[model samples]
Structures are given as structure tokens and as C-alpha cells.
Target chain A: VNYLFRGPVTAVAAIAGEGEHAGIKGSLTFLQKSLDGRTVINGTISGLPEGKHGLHIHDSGDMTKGCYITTAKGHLNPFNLSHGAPSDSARHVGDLGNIYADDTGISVINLTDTVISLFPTPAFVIGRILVIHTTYDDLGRGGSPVSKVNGNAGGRLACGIISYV
Target chain B: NYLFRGPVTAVAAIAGEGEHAGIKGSLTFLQKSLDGRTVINGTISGLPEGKHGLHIHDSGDMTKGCYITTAKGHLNPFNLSHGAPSDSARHVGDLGNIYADDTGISVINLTDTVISLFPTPAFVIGRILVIHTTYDDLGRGGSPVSKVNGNAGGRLACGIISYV
Candidate 1:
């Protein structure tokens, strides 16, 4: 079956202007199978300027700045492994790839895997966190200047939750 | 050697019902370089906790409820297939992860494979910055603390990241 979750994009962090783009509207499409099965996620992010931004799954769904203590702790790595590259042997389960913005500032993302399910119960995403970095994520465990492939994705620009029904 | 920078002007949020709701802090982009690669650096302060998910979304439209709809779509430049680490042919806009602590503030510095910035019209300007209600799942399942399902629940707050 298919599940759709829609809503506006709010700023958990702080922004400058009080215009429209400062807010966002979008939706997430989920293909459900089973709680332990695989699911496909697709969605569109609107209200942005044309270009690329950072995208990833955070640790919590709490929208509080202090929520990071309970939220944004780390990526969703259930296997108890180190945060490796998206193609590494040891990486976080929430380690999805990057999301690019088009000429119109629109970004479309699509992915399917067993890490998160939809049937019996909303799988991997429900209650999880999705983060958009102001920069890129290097995927390594070190400082910058060495490789942009480490955890170099800049500041916590935007964020959201994977709500299911 | 191109840098795109902007200042954040406002911030706000909404709660589903009897849930935890607040705006946290705010941040601004200092400089972003575009040249087959994108990098955005800035500082976030006045936040409650330290770590959080930072994202750039498709559209910038916030009419449907505060959720701006003008940000467009997810950055999928390669049109590659999906999956996670073990999978190949992933999109080009995916920048993996981030972190924050307890000071309720932090600095952001990053570089991406694909270029998504301003003037080029392939990055996140006029887009929305959504702060998840929960933490990230780290790409795992089986735990209620996982961000696998879009983190937490309902959007607590939101803002738009536009060009300066």
C-alpha cells in the first residue's frame, strides 16, 4: 500500500527574514509492506531557491533546540557501528544519500530499502529525524580539510520528522 | 572560488496538540562555494540543546500551513536509484548527517559533492529549513528512538532559507 504524509516546513533553528521561503510546504510518500520489510520513500521540497542543500536522517524527532540532547544525538545506526560512509561496511541505518535542488530550487528525493518498513507498523522512519545540513556531509570521522567526504556537512539548517499513520 | 551568503530574518513553529513545541535558536549562512561542489558555513545560537538535523528542502511555499511550499524538491541531480550504503547509483544531493550538543548552539561547516547554491539555481535558496521534532534514526530500525521514519512526529517549527 501507499502512505502519504504532508505538512509545512518550520525552522527549528533560527532564520533571518519573515518572508515566504522562510517557511516550506512538502510531502512524503511511503510504500508499506511490513514492519520488518522494505519501504520506498519519495517526496518533494518546495519554497526553496534553485540549488543544492544537505539532506540526512537525524537521531530524534524533537523540534526543541535542546531536543538534540534527546534528539539529533547521531544518525540512526541500529547496528551499533561507527558512523561510516553510505557505502561503508559500518554506517548508520539512516545514512541516505544527498538531495540536490533543481534550477527552480525544487528537490525531489526517492529511495527504497528494508531499513524502514510500512506494514504491520510504520517502519524505520516513524519517530525518526531527517536533517538538512547547510553544507555537505564528508561521511568520515575526522576534521575538515582532509576530505569533504567526512561528517563535514555544515550547520543544522533545516529539519523534520518522518510521521506515519 | 564562489561564495553565497545570507542572513536569517525570522523563525516560528506549530505543535500537533499536547506535544513539546518551541523555536529553539537561529542561524545564518556565512558563505557557500559553488563549483561542482557546494559548501555552507554558519553559526547557530540561542538553541536549547546542541545537536540537531540540518536540512535543505525543495520548495519555499509556506502557505499550506507554515510549511513553505516554494523549496521545490529533493536534490536528485544524478537521477540514480535508491537504497542506502550497500547500494549503488544514489542521488548526488544526499549529504548524509550532522551533530549538535547541549549549549543550544553550534557552528556549521560543510562541503558537498554536487553544487547546490545561489546564482547557479541548483542549491537551497528560497528553500525551507525544517527542524525535525526528533533525532535521526542513523539509518536503522527496531528502536523507538530511531529517526528512520522522518524523526519524532509532527513539525514543531520551520523557516525559510533564502538568498541575501
Candidate 2:
């Protein structure tokens, strides 16, 4: 049987935009599964710019009520943690780092994150927004300054709600 | 850092006077990212013993004092018919029932596969969570009213699912 809960708990996000990546469109499907004692995020996203893009769960799931980035809020750093990479011990749980787009404008996301959980934890964002930014997140490494918590990620190019089903 | 990437919450309140008179309780929605199912945990008090239909209504219009009429029907976004919680195709708001003890106390920690805490079209947060006066018939052989109310009696208590 599937451990932890009753299913291969799934969530998804449809990414579309009206800006630089206007024509770019894709969908992200998320899976929640337990391998031993770890939670693995296995999913696929397509239709992106040929470069790095900031991918993080936002605080709100309001991508439909208004504009994407402008309404989705910021990275889900509920604990007031500084901007950091997904591998960092002091990073936001919503910090999924970056997903690189290929010449075909797509990225395969396959990684095990320590802070990201599909279970009902304080940082869980089943009802929040997943945003794809116009700029690549520096992961607080470019200047290593507190001045840029957003890693200079530009406006929201695409976004969708991560809903639990 | 929080263990999960999203957020979870528990909203509580004491049912204002009127229909419920003096009932109180709280509901905690856990967006368990680990399993992908949102757990609905609730502990309530102040009601008659036996089974009471429990459901999520379409609106949270408690403005006219609790059991306001504007909070009509179940949150059936799919236009589905009414049925038991265990039924394969039931109203989205159909949570079956909550059995209270002789002391009028009940605790529920049921997990759902269809409902979500997110702002998806299927599940909206600021709706009304109501406890009916009787057991819902689940659209079984019962009064024609069962088609809508599940033969569930009056509204006993209700609270809005807000500020998630």
C-alpha cells in the first residue's frame, strides 16, 4: 500500500503567461510519495524560456482572481527565513530552487527536498500558488546580500494553484 | 524551517446564539503534503445526541444571524446529486454525519480525497460548515426532500470556514 496516506496524493499547476513568455505554456503535476523516510517530488513542467527560472510556492493561491505574480504574493517563507537555496538548511520551505528550461522550453523536476512535505505541516502549501518567475533565482549567491530576498527574480511569467486532491 | 512547503491552519469559533444557541468548536484543516490528502479534524459540543448531518454549504452567510437562508444548499460545484459520504458520487459538501454522545459532544478526524484547502474551483475556503438537525438519508429511499436535504432536519449549528 502507499505509505503515510490513502493515495498517490497529487497536485498540479498550469503555467501560462501574457508577457515575455506569453506564448510559453505548460503544466506541472506533483506527486507525494514516501520512499523510505523521505518525501520525493516527482513532476514535469514544459514551455519555458531557454534559461533558469525561479520556481517557488507563493503564500497565496490567487492566480485566477488577478494577475499571476502580482496577486500570488511572495515565496512562502512563513518562518521569516532569509532567501536561500532548497538545499540550504536556512532556506524557505517553498524554496524549490530553480528549474532550467531546455531549448525545447521544458524541465524535468526530480528531487528530494528536506523541507518540502506533502503532509499537513506548517509550511505545507496545498492551496497556494506555484509561480514561475521571469528571472533566474540567484539562490542568494550572486551577491550573498540580504538586500535581495527574491534573488532578483523578475515578474511572474506563469503561475497556477497547487491543489490537493 | 517548516516541514511542509505549503501552509495549514485551524479555525475556531463559538456558534453565536440563535439556531445553535450556545455551541462551540473548532476545525483544523491539514494539507498533509506527505500523503496529498487534506485531513479535516474537528471537535464540537452543544447538540442533541445521535447522528447529525454535517456538510459544507455553498456560502458562509451567517450575517442574518447564524442559520441564514443565504447559505443555501451543499457546496455542489459539480452539480452532482446528494449521497452518503462514502458514495462514489456525492455532493462535494457531503461529509455524511457527526454522531454526538448523550452529553452532546463529538469529535471528528476524517480524511477526505475530494475536498481541498486550496482555492481551486472544486473547493472554496470561505464557505459555510453546517451541522444539520438530523441524519442525512444520502439520497436513499426516503422523503422526496431527501433528494436535497437528505431528509436531514433543521440546522443545528454552523460556522464559516474563513481565514485559512
Candidate 3:
């Protein structure tokens, strides 16, 4: 089986650009052979200032208010367990670490894992939506105003559907 | 020659949950034969709305924040001067453009002459594949920020595009 995944940018929604504040743009890249049948995913977010932003995978695919609020319902812990950090066993499959932006307000991320699939009909990410949060996902109950599970990633700046080419 | 084949993906740089939050769904699919012609088929999803410049760099090193410096230079064919896609006298490495949608999504299909002409049998791309956050400007003019024309934006992400 191959791997499938998405690269959603959080800074896109937080940055103010061309008469718009908190504007978001979405794009995705996929890897067919990333190690152990997994794929490496990466992307670039523009229009932000530069710094560290919280990044994670929400549990929903609904994009409400142009932001990712409705789409990003919660952490995608299909196991029906409590929220935990990315490194935590209790965390959902949607939980990823944070992304860093440079001085120009652009973030470049590259990641790989066996969890994602793209071949054999692309099982892993068939019906999932990618979300970009406003704040960092502090793993679980990290004292961040956001949900203990999703780290209160604030609003969904951008959203995208995961599809196989 | 045409001996190697593979795929690649280019996604948006976001921080959140869902398909876009993890390392799975963001890559630009690329395939090439030993003849050197590179065919790219894939979409750039989960990006913020707007146009983003796209290209194939010389390396896939991602240890340093996806820095373009790690990807070396563009694949130049015929050793010609680096020029834009619209230019005939330019280097064959010049891949014209990649457009991002209102939601920062871009599905692209293009070919590169550099990979088509190179006749070397050795695996050249064992290094890395890199994606930039900005456009090439296509003017063929150099930018001070980074080399290969200051393709200087930030490196959105990188991976090793190897033979399958």
C-alpha cells in the first residue's frame, strides 16, 4: 500500500495580506514511497510574519465560515480515547507537531510516516479534511486556552480535502 | 536510458488537525525516465488562497528547515543560461509556473527537458527533492537572498525523490 497525506498551512490564515487579515491559502503534496509504504508530505505557507505556529490534524472535514472551524471538529482519535500530545499514545491520529516560520513568514515542513497510505485504493486518507489551527496543539491539557486535546488552535484559517491523483 | 521511476507531492504548510495537519497529504508527484524527461502529476492542497511559485531543485536535504540552499541549483540542460519558461535561449531547467487556488490549492502537470536530456546512468537524485514557498519570478534575474536567482523565499518542505 502507498501513503497519502496533506500539508495545510496555519500561518496563511493568521497573516494579514493585501487588505485582508487572517487570509488562508491551501495546497498539498503526496509521496508514494516514503519508507515502509508511507509517503513524505511537505508544503509552504505564505503571507505570515514568521514564528512558531501550532499544527495538528482535526477530526472533521467540514469547513465553516471559510475558516476551518466546522471542518476541524476535534482531534481525530478514532479509538474514542481522551486527548493527548502527539507523542502520547492516547492522542488521535490527527495530532502532529508544531510548524516553524522564518522571518519572511513562510513555513516549510517535511514529514514521513507509515500511518498514511496512497495505494491499494489509498485507504488511510480517503475521506479526511486537512485543517490549519491558529495556535499550537500543546499535546494534551498543556494549559493552552484551546481544548486540552487540540491545544485551542483558535480558528481554522484554511481547509482542504485529501484526494489521490 | 530511462531507468528510474517515482512520485512526489507538494502541499501547503499548515498547523492543525485533519488531513492537512500531519506528514501524509502534502507532496508534488513527479516521475522521470532515464532519458531525463520528468513528468509531474499531483496537486498542492491545504494551502492558503493565492498563487505560489513551484520548481524542482537540485537536492532533497530537509535537515535545515527546508532551506533552498540545501537543494542546490536547478537541473540545467545543455548548460545554457538560466532563463524563464517563456524564454527559448534559457536553461532547460526552467519550469514555468504553478498556480495555487483561492484555498491555496494547485494541481499541476508539466515536463522538464533537463531530466530528458541527461544520459547518465548513475542515480543523481539520491540527494533530495525540495519545494519553495515563493515563485521563481521567471525573469531569470538573480535574487540576493539565495542563489539560483534568489529563489530565496523559505523552503516549504523537502524529500528524497528516488527511483521506485
Candidate 4:
């Protein structure tokens, strides 16, 4: 018999405001139908500016010093690739692109990615960090130095670690 | 046979707003010790004087504050019935009760083998923790909902468990 999926994995992140973004709070859930399937992320966030914000999985889970550009380190780029949008084949594994908040400052996170995983070894996202940037991701077309590294996403506004549910 | 690698840890900042506003605390988790147990410890304040149930709910959604519908049911990945922390057939989220002093403070320190911080089915990080308004029945109270939720009553406060 053919199964629709096998051993589905579900994970989540509890985002909290950091430093100047202390008012921000939200929760994102990550799911994969199977070990080889794409990851589907969905959540809702409140207390944001009326615009887009970059969302990425940084390399570290340590928030002892609080969320910042350096504390959570860079994006999860195990393949050593430049940053790009979710549709790009040559993008960082962490680059899921930007999420937009409406006029009332509420944002919905809904994205599907093939590069990220909740499994074992190098690609596993558990214990890593999720960050919302102060600006929208330029998708590497900004022609700036930081654009290639992180899509010119700017500073981290809020962050939290991706963890098992 | 093990080398010098240390224990894995997780944490949570528990707080309640709205009607349960005063409840707040922090919890630390240590996974996979020598005894294969997950150790947890914390200090919570603003509880009513008595024992209260503690559990790990399935969802991490706390947008509407601490409630049954928002955080959903207990973390029962195995679809088992609810029981005490020590029961073998209980829900993975069944963590029993915590006591608060007359000053409305509780210093929590406990351990369990069913709940963990590692990458397993019972892994608890990213889940929501609910502190109930009354004591858990441990699946022995003859109530209609006892096997489902241990008659834990309503949610008093909650927070999301996160990686440290």
C-alpha cells in the first residue's frame, strides 16, 4: 500500500521581541510531511511596522546576550551559498524571504521551502534561531555588499530558537 | 563509553496577561542524564495557594493568551490516555502537579523520562506549557473527562518552551 506520507515532523518557534523590538511576539510552526518532503511554515505575528520584514533561521540558538546581528550569528548557510529568495535555486538554506505586516501591524507567516529540514545531521533546524529583520529582504538584487550575504535584511528585530514540539 | 560532551538544555519564559496577568516565571530543562531522565527546574509566582497541574500542550500558539483552544490539548503524540507523570500509558505531556505556597510562589524541580529536549517524538521544546487552576486527577478520578485531561481544570497561565 502506498502511504501519503511517513514519519511527519513538526517543529515550532516562539518569537520574542529583542532590545528595541520588545513589543513583538509571535509563534511559527514548521512541518514536513515526510523526511524528504518540503517544509511548510505557518504562524501569526503581532506588533510590527506596516511593511515587510525578513525572516531567517540564524546559526545559533544562544539568546543569552539577546537578539542581535552578531549574537545569533549569521544565516544557516551550510552550502556556502549567497542569499536569495525562496524561489531561487542558489539561496541560503535560511533564506525563506520576507513576511509582510498589514496596516494594523499583524503579519502572517506562510512559506514552503525544500532546503530546510527538521531531521538529523547538518540540515536539522532544531536548536537553531529564527529572526525577523528590521527591513524586507532584497532577494540579493539590491547590489549591495550585505545583500549577497543576507539579502540586505538589516538588523534583527526579534528572534527565537526553532525547537521540537 | 561517553566522552566529555555535556547535557542538552532548553528554557522558557512563562508569563500570563489579561485575567491571569500576575503569573510568571522561568523554567530550565536538562535532557538525557545518566539515568535517561529529563530534569526540569524553575520558580513561578502569582499562583493561588494550593497545588496546580503542569502540562505541555500540543500547540505553541499563545496569541489569544492562556486557554484550552489556543494552546490546544496535551502533547499526546502517541494518542494515549491521560495519566500521571509516572504512568507508562499516559500522555507525553502529563507532568503532574506543582505546589504553591501561601505567598503565591512555587519553586519547581522535577524530572521525567517521557518528556525530553532532544529530537524525539516526546521532545517538548517549542510546545506550550499550561499551568492549570486545580490539581490533576492523575487519571484516577472517575470524572467523564479524566482519561482525556486528568480533570486538570482550566488554564491559569502558560508559555512557550524554547531552545536556550
lDDT of 1 by residue, B41-73 (tens): 555444446344444444444435444333323
Which ranking of candidates, highest TM-score first? 4, 2, 1, 3
Winner by DockQ: 4
Model 2 lDDT tens row, A1-165: 212234455545545565566676666666666322345655556677788888887766443222343432467877778778888877776788888888897777776666765544565555566787877888877884542477777777776555433
For each candidate in the order shown, give its overall lDDT on alpha carbons: 0.44, 0.66, 0.45, 0.78
Q: Sort by lDDT, best first: what order?
A: 4, 2, 3, 1
TM-scores of the models, in the order given: 0.41, 0.52, 0.40, 0.75
> What DockQ results for candidate 1?
0.02
True interface contacts reproduced, per candidate: 0.00, 0.04, 0.00, 0.20
Residues B73-134, candidate 3: write the lDDT tens digits.
Answer: 65553455555665675444455556666766667676654443122322223223344556
Residue B48 error, candidate 1, Å: 28
The superposed Cα distance between candidate 1 and the true structure at residue B75, in angstroms, equals 35
lDDT of 1 by residue, A29-133 (tens): 555544444566677766554555555666454443422324325765545665556566665666665666677766786766555432212223433446665
Write candidate 3's Cα lDDT for A67-91 as tens digits.
Answer: 3343324655555665565566665
For model 2, the stretches where C-alpha displacement exceeds 4 angstroms are A1-8, A19-22, A34-37, A69-73, A144-148, B1-164
Regions more than 4 Å wrong, model 3: A1-23, A32-36, A119-123, A144-147, B1-164
Tell me which of candidates 2 and 4 scores higher on lDDT: 4
